[PDB]
Amino acid sequence: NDNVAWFKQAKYGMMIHWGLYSLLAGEYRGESSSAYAEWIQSKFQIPNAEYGNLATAFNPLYFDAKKIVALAKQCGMQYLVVTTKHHDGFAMYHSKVDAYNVYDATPFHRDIIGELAEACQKAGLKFGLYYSQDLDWHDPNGGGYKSNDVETAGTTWDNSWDFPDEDQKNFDLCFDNKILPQIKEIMSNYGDIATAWFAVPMTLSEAQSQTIYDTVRELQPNCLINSRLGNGKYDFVSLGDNEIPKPSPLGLYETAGTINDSWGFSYHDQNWKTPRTLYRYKQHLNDFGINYLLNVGLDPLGRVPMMAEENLLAAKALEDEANRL
Amino acid sequence: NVAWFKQAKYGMMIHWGLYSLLAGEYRGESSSAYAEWIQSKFQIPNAEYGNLATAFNPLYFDAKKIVALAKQCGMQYLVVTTKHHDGFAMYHSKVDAYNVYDATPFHRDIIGELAEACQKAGLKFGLYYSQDLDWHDPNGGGYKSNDVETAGTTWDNSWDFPDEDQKNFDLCFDNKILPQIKEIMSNYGDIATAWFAVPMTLSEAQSQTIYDTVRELQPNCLINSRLGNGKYDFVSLGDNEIPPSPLGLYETAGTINDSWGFSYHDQNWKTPRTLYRYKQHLNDFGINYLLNVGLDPLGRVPMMAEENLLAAKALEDEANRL
Amino acid sequence: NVAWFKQAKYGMMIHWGLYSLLAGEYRGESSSAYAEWIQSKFQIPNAEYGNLATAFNPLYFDAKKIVALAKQCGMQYLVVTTKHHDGFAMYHSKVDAYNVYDATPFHRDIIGELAEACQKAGLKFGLYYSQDLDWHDPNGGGYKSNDVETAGTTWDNSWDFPDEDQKNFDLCFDNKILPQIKEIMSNYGDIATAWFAVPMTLSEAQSQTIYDTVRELQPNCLINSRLGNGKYDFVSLGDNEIPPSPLGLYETAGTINDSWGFSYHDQNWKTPRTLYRYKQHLNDFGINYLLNVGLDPLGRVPMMAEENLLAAKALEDEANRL
Amino acid sequence: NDNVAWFKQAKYGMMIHWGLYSLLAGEYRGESSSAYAEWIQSKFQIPNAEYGNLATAFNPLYFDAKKIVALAKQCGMQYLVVTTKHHDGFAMYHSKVDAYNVYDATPFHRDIIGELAEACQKAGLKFGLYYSQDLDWHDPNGGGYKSNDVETAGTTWDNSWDFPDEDQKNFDLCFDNKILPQIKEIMSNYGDIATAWFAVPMTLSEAQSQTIYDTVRELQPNCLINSRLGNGKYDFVSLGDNEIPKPSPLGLYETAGTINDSWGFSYHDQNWKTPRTLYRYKQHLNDFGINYLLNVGLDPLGRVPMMAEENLLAAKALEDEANRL
Ligand SMILES: CC(=O)N[C@@H]1[C@@H](O)[C@H](O)[C@@H](CO[C@@H]2O[C@@H](C)[C@@H](O)[C@@H](O)[C@@H]2O)O[C@H]1O
Ligand SMILES: CC(=O)N[C@@H]1[C@@H](O)[C@H](O)[C@@H](CO[C@@H]2O[C@@H](C)[C@@H](O)[C@@H](O)[C@@H]2O)O[C@H]1O
Ligand SMILES: CC(=O)N[C@@H]1[C@@H](O)[C@H](O)[C@@H](CO[C@@H]2O[C@@H](C)[C@@H](O)[C@@H](O)[C@@H]2O)O[C@H]1O
Ligand SMILES: CC(=O)N[C@@H]1[C@@H](O)[C@H](O)[C@@H](CO[C@@H]2O[C@@H](C)[C@@H](O)[C@@H](O)[C@@H]2O)O[C@H]1O
């Protein structure tokens, strides 16, 4: 596991958020999502029957793994993270365990995680996966239902509309049958997984948390794990905005951000960070040994938004200018 | 129909086609201000552009809700792109399989649903048709008028069909335009208004011909000053043409933002106050206002389009009680 | 005054000071979301920032027109920055020459003109005052609470006066705050509402003291829950505090865009529909809505602020006849 | 006059629009100017009495000639053009002949053209002047009054509100007493004038046009003149949008543009051309030997707008990256 040497010096990665939310793109029956377009289902409490129907329209003719990695590489990014399955519970890979996925439910009929994994392999880009182990709005017993006190980017953390029998919910039925099986799948196919990115535990017991830790280590021996899974059970610390100038034993650090203000594609969110904002931030994080993980929200046709692409390239140009200074 | 049109005051225009899905973006680059021209701007081969049809699945398209919205804003008629410059028919065309019904997963007659929804809602129903430009046909129009600049590149499909001189527009007219014009003027019930583009190549003969087809099939259908000089019922006026028309019928078209087709990046929405003031001014001059919405790939009125249109109606009402 | 405040529903807040002229820009760089903090964000020396006073000449400032506008929107009271964190008084302060009247070409009492304009217009008149932060005074407040982050840098003027421990807030309170509070509570006629900032350093003693000054001078003046616990009349609620107050009087403050001070670059204006819906929701919960405008260097309501506020009023009226 | 060799290779210049219009910044009594904020007086037919009053507020503490030229030079611009006097008739220099000027009428009490001229001299930047020889809204007999047929960025071309006796107007009274005297002043002080930039003649007779030509040649022997003055009477052709791929005998070409859509500062016009748009356009023009003259509309405090500055620098960075390719 030389992953430690490479990660301390990697400096820069691309993150991709993509799913059904990208097609609504922050808009519903004349109204805006919150800041988080990928949260749109919770914001408006969209029934699974309706929300799920987007799968029939998901036909991104312009999705192109080859082209995306070329762009990333040109900007000097050394690794790539992708949404394998977000809060909405729609798998972006061909899951044996669950047919609610890009491959089975959509005209596209293709493995999003796969095509990117290969392209990355060939380009010499490391390949990471993101997975939402706790919230899952598709599963009757999804997590979140005891932590509804805290405010969210939607309404409740859990699917409180389709499944309102709050007391009769049991996350375990969800954990054993979907989360752990799906985690097993993604950690086994698509080759070497360099980085593992989990969502924020609210409900997953330490037992359940420990299980995932163990599962990943045996399946992907060299895979570095983000501090989010569970206390004691990680390799690099994910830093949040206010953690920017808990303990990291390998000396490995990452902060994730987006270029505009949303993680998922949002038509109306044109508040793109300037090239200079992008470059300066990277410089500051890197000098503090913190890696910068920069998100692209793919558009409905599978394209990097024009303004996202432009701004990334200018920050790279600025960087080169400045580093020959 | 004449009395009704003189008092109508307000109409909806709809741009819709394959171009709406690219939404102003092509291989990392921006369309012009006019997003619906996107195929020409970048000279997208017919094979590829047409392929968009395989992705055209607007689950949230809803003629009823759209017309309900239109009516709520006080609009008395609605015009729709039956077929724009791209040569893609948005109705179930017998003569050409390059159409919404046969070529797309959606597999539905957009014009039909709107025609019925309008009939049932008691809204008049108009049609737009590109009788001159046709980027899908080897002998499509446009190739004699290329000195003047466009919102794309050439007027014609000069890329797939570059044999400029061996092109002959007559072959296209005989086989696609007039048949398609015949199609739309017979189905979809009463057609109150007919909207044609600006001839470049269509001879006076051809211009007169289309007129006749409409008169025989749709006697009271009012025709826009674009067909031919002497051979029309209302004059289309542009912004800069307003400070003959034999019936005294007048219309000016605009868009809410700066594009006709949906364009992700064009958020330069005119404020509600701008929209309302213009209509009042036009109406006071008896000019009818036809205001265009370019619906997005899911068939939705863009949020800012809907909000601002509705706010303009509220603004109008306050002032007429004032 | 209590009965009137319970039914008022709608107020204007005004941010104004030297910061408005920089308008979100300093030596090529952006302020935070909160433009009025600009001096702290970049640690602009008092000598330089104060120098803005020499440029403060708002020829188009017009209290009458502003109040006319406010009244037209149905607002029943108006609050103004008498002196914000920057420590610049926007009224003719006897105690400190760092003020609009003496230090600026404009040479006018902004609060006075507004107080009169409001009296004459029949609008109630409120005051905002930064009783705690004061970036102009060597011993200004803020220096005991620097672990928590701000919209600038430090809470206090930690740059001109970096001798953190040899600072003593009491000296500032005695010489500037309470005298200035005394000033504003005696002149400018009837004061209906009083708006203080969040204590960091102001002891309970000092908090109680200001209260007394207001009660003696302005018996019916209603006081915002910021002064001190038990020692107040209405509770200021923030967005996230709403899904004690002994009189049942409540107010929530917001801005139209994302900044309090004028900021050239902050064009993220909330649409009219957003503004109207929020007010209705608050009012239904009896919470009064106080909506802030940061006037620009010429004393003007920004075009998009005026347009959207007025459109929101029209929107409100339509719905209550519906 | 080696100006020919230098200009064919100069490639890039800064233009500055600045005057009273910058303080209204595209806004009047709750309403927007047209696209051209510097036209604001005509758009709303603002009486001279009111419009002129802005002079008392013109106190740009942050005007800084030194800093502006440094920025320009860093972007590789080889010359600088400035508004000496725009359509509004407000002189931005200390005019002996007319007290309606930055020096006499404003607290600033400073010569805008002068301070920039010196800074440019010291930096090794060439120094050009723009002057509106035809429209002058301050003069009772200003030009424009026979050409009111054509649509403008305001209303009429002339001051049609304060001075409506259209038939009793005589441009000559204006030409002899203000235009030619003021042109004499600006072409004599402030040292060598490398470039001369005139507005669009509508009304200035050939006689009057010839006069200006002659006046400049004797006063500034080596000064290159923009094709706008008069047919036969120029050194470089000013190209407009539609003249971009009449006759230029020296082979000298310039196109002027702005970064956003306005020439004068406009608070509300945030439609800044992207860095990439700026760079690509320059490249295209330069390859066709056409010089690119790029406008900055100084803000009320005399500062280059933040987004204007940022975008210029990124285009330069992109250019450097690409030219080492
Ligand atoms: C109140 C609120 O919205 N708080 C948000 C959380 O809702 C949000 O989950 C969290 C981080 O966002 C999570 O991680 C990113 C990477 C993306 O996957 C989101 O969809 C996740 O929800 O940020 C808080 O501020
Ligand atoms: C530069 C440019 O292309 N300018 C365009 C013209 O090309 C265009 O013909 C004209 C009219 O627009 C026509 O009608 C609208 C409704 C839409 O269908 C366009 O695609 C048509 O070309 O508008 C000018 O601005
Ligand atoms: C990160 C940050 O600074 N957040 C700010 C706080 O600093 C601020 O205290 C709080 C309340 O804002 C206060 O009142 C408004 C009206 C204005 O005068 C501000 O300058 C004050 O500080 O708001 C948080 O968002
Ligand atoms: C109809 C219209 O607005 N036409 C405008 C003219 O009004 C305008 O004068 C012209 C060029 O603008 C002139 O030159 C620039 C450099 C600047 O000084 C402007 O203030 C001048 O008016 O462009 C036409 O399109």
Residue numbers in the entry:
A (entry chain A), D (entry chain A): 2 to 246, 266 to 345
B (entry chain C), C (entry chain C): 4 to 246, 267 to 345
Sentences from the paper on this structure:
Lactobacillus casei produces a GH29A α-fucosidase, AlfC, that is ~104-fold more active on α(1-6)-fucosyl linkages compared to other linkages.
In contrast, AlfC cannot accommodate longer carbohydrate linkages (as seen in untreated IgG), because O4 of GlcNAc (which connects to another GlcNAc) would point directly toward the surface of the enzyme, creating steric clashes for any polysaccharide longer than two residues. When the Fucα(1,6)GlcNAc crystal structure is superimposed over the closed state conformation from the molecular dynamics simulation, it is apparent that the closed state still accommodates the glycan well, with D200 and D242 flanking the reactive C1 of fucose. They also provide a rationale for the requirement of endoglycosidase pre-treatment of antibodies before defucosylation, as additional sugars attached to the +1 sugar would clash with the enzyme surface.
